[PDB]
Design a protein around this nucleic acid. Structure first.
Ligand SMILES: [Mg+2]
Ligand SMILES: [Mg+2]
Length: 733
RNA sequence: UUACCAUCAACAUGGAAACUUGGCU
RNA sequence: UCCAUGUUGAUGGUAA
């Protein structure tokens, strides 16, 4: 899995390495012949002979883990419980811990108890802090930091994956909220928690008929008033006498007094305030340095408590004091090509400025084309056409005066009538200017322009052509998109792999149109990866959909055969849309279908397939380290070891000006191409530049994003299989 | 629907929820 | 009673 391409760069990830040696731990089964309903009964059964069962036990259904070997492997205890007792049959039996899949679960439970050994309380899965708030003393709000941690196993051993989050908070009481509100949804949705007994309480129902003078039987004794109760419990007073009360019932009733409460989350009015969200964005969008600061403070809190550390010592695992530090490598910047010119990409990996003033490779003379709009939007469309005339000769295209057609009114019926009248064999592109953003009209227009009488078209809104001092870049972007939707290529990159047909797949999961689960298939056609062939497989099955994908692959391969007079030696399938629940299905079910029927085109024709799974969401964050400063790494950084599981890698390719850049995770589930891992990594980096919508770099490779866009367009708007006349073009950008 | 990326709320169908002191109302 | 897999509003940034 090793590869040496670029220059070394020191980086650090948010992984705390757990030097945890599990020795002597064995899954002891206790059980009993007469079943007992209560889990607490079983826990107390263990605790009765806890002197022999140990002072540090993990029992969650008779799967008793004790840290050290029991002196007698088989130990039988008969004991009587409290209710009747039934002569419980406690008997110790041994089960091995060899497989090590139980080790991660044991780690998780012990580490949960270790996290609660501190004074961090839980408002969920996260254990939010209640001692170091981030005051925002203008909105009366308050931000609590908190941590979510998940022990996992990586190439370097066991890593505590760690990520910080912020939970908002107010300081005005609930009665202040009710003061300013003189409704039900805001109060019920909020999760009010009292300060004295710091635990989260959920409000489900309100009763505007109770009061503090009401009585509740305390300690199963006599009646007490809420004022008396809180006076005798926590030494405080409550002033109001006819205020509402809040009812909380778990899954008897708990009556919260809405003066001691403190609402949480954000209310709709609080969210609507632009200033509030602008202020909280600064804290929520954490740069790398502040994220590292919170991480370091968490490590110090774990280390210096002396209660969590004792439990760590008890279970025999060592914890480390600094976040993981590794030595990654940065691939060189890529020479972007144009017609008789080249530009080396920035350290930011963005060449919009050079794209605006440099000649594209292939340009289509936009001779015959027409513009469609309502009368109200005449001047804006005319001004847009003038700027398209202005900005095209600089970049290479020769644009002529389009045709000028108006529609009777704004209704979809008139647009459809005008399109049915207008479309002719010679017409190349139709521009349609929507006065608003209505989904059904867009669906009908794209239906007519992609199924019935297929012609590539550009729809644009009357919002992005009215704001002057910005229409120049809008025209320069629409011009490139228009060139893309005609068979012309914009830029190119030096790709040193001959005869490697690249494939991209992504599936549009959706329960909107019959849960059809539309797919998308995109395949390259030339040695430079600048022309694409796009098909879609829409099926209500998990088996025959792969047969449609088989047909798509066969058609793409024969298209390559026509367009290059030979067949590809390699096929690389960058697969997208596969999460963590359904990772295995590709490896064993979809892949052999691709492997099976490639013998129809040649004598023992077996192209060297290789399948790659793309995950855009991960809990890993990678910072570059300069001296003692943490900052986002530049685009083009590879991390292929010490945080990777099985022949995979992390690529940083996006540039983000706000917060921490999220790397993209690439696995190679099926590898038969014969390419070295280094060349596959470099190919995945180079394909990142090949997305025409955005000059620069993107998260996923260009084929995967193209497939996602095709599937999205087919599933959301067309609801049908688009025509075959538009396959060789990119008609979905 | 000119595009790409960082946060964050509601509506759909994947798990789950024990410790611990026992103890919130 | 909460977090996941998501499907969608309203916020931020960029673009000579
Ligand atoms: Mg997708
Ligand atoms: Mg378009």
């Amino acid at each position: 899995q090793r590869g040496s391409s670029g220059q070394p760069v020191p980086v650090s990830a948010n992984y705390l390495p757990l030097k945890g040696n599990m020795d002597g731990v064995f899954k002891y089964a206790v059980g009993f012949n007469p079943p007992v309903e209560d889990i607490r009964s079983r826990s107390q059964l263990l605790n009765e002979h806890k002197e022999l069962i140990g002072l540090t036990r993990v029992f969650d259904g008779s799967t008793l883990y004790v840290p050290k070997r029991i002196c007698e492997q088989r130990l039988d205890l008969m004991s009587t419980r409290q209710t009747d007792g039934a002569s419980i049959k406690v008997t110790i039996s041994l089960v091995d811990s060899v497989k090590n899949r139980d080790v991660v679960q044991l780690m998780n439970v012990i580490f949960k108890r270790i996290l609660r050994s501190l004074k961090l309380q839980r408002i969920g899965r996260d254990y939010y802090d209640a001692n170091s708030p981030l005051e925002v003393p203008q909105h009366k709000m308050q931000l609590w930091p908190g941590y979510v941690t998940a022990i996992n196993r990586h190439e370097g051993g066991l890593m505590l994956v760690l990520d910080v989050s912020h939970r908002v908070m107010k300081t005005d009481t609930a009665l202040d909220f009710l003061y300013e509100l003189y409704a039900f949804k805001q109060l019920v949705g909020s999760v009010v928690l009292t300060r004295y007994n710091n635990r989260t309480y959920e409000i489900d129902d309100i009763a505007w008929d109770k009061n503090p003078r009401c009585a509740f039987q305390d300690h199963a004794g006599s009646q007490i008033t809420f004022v008396d109760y809180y006076k005798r419990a926590y030494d405080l007073d409550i002033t109001d006498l006819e205020q509402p009360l809040l009812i909380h019932r778990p899954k008897e009733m708990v009556c919260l007094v809405p003066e001691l409460c403190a609402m949480t989350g954000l209310t709709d009015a609080a969210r609507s305030d632009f200033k509030v969200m602008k202020d909280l964005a600064v804290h929520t969008r954490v740069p790398p340095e502040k994220r590292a600061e919170s991480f370091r403070k968490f490590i110090q809190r774990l280390n210096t408590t002396k209660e969590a550390s004792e439990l760590l010592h008890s279970w025999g695992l060592v914890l480390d004091s600094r976040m993981l530090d590794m030595q990654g490598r940065r691939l060189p910047p890529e020479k972007i090509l144009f017609k008789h010119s080249s530009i080396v990409a920035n350290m930011e990996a963005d060449w919009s400025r050079e794209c605006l003033k440099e000649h594209v490779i292939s340009a289509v003379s936009l001779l015959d084309w027409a513009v469609l709009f309502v009368r109200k939007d005449q001047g804006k469309a005319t001004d847009f056409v003038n700027m398209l005339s202005k900005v095209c000769p600089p970049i290479g295209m020769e644009v002529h005066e389009p045709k000028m057609v108006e529609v009777v009114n704004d209704r979809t019926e008139s647009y459809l009538r005008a399109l049915r009248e207008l479309i002719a064999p010679r017409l190349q592109m139709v521009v349609i200017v929507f006065p608003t953003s209505r989904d059904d009209r867009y669906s009908a227009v794209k239906k007519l322009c992609c199924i019935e009488s297929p012609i590539p078209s550009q729809v644009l809104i009357a919002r992005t052509i009215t704001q002057q001092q910005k229409l120049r870049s809008v025209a320069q972007k629409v011009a490139l998109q228009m060139n893309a939707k005609l068979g012309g290529e914009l830029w190119a990159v030096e790709i040193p792999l001959k005869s490697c047909m690249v494939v991209g797949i992504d599936v549009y999961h959706d329960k909107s149109y019959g849960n059809k689960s539309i797919a998308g298939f995109v395949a390259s056609t030339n040695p430079s990866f600048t022309r694409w062939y796009s098909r879609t497989a829409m099926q209500e099955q998990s088996q025959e959909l792969i047969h449609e994908l088989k047909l798509c692959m066969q058609a793409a391969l024969k298209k390559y055969n026509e367009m290059n007079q030979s067949l590809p030696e390699r096929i690389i399938v960058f697969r997208d849309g596969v999460g963590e629940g359904r990772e295995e299905y590709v490896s064993e079910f979809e892949v052999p279908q691709f492997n099976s029927c490639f013998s129809i085109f040649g004598e023992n024709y077996c192209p060297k397939l290789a399948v790659v799974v793309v995950q855009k969401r991960i809990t890993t964050r990678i910072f570059g380290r300069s001296g003692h400063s943490y900052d986002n790494p530049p685009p083009g950084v590879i991390v292929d070891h010490t945080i990777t599981k099985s022949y995979d890698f992390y690529l940083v390719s996006q540039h983000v000006r706000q917060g921490t850049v999220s790397p993209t995770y690439y696995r190679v589930i099926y590898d038969k191409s014969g390419l070295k891992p280094d060349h596959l990594q470099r190919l995945t980096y180079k394909l990142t530049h090949m997305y025409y919508n955005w000059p620069g770099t993107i998260r996923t490779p260009a084929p995967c994003k193209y497939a996602h866009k095709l599937a999205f367009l087919v599933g959301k708007s067309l609801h049908r299989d688009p025509a075959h006349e538009l396959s060789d073009r990119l008609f979905f950008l």
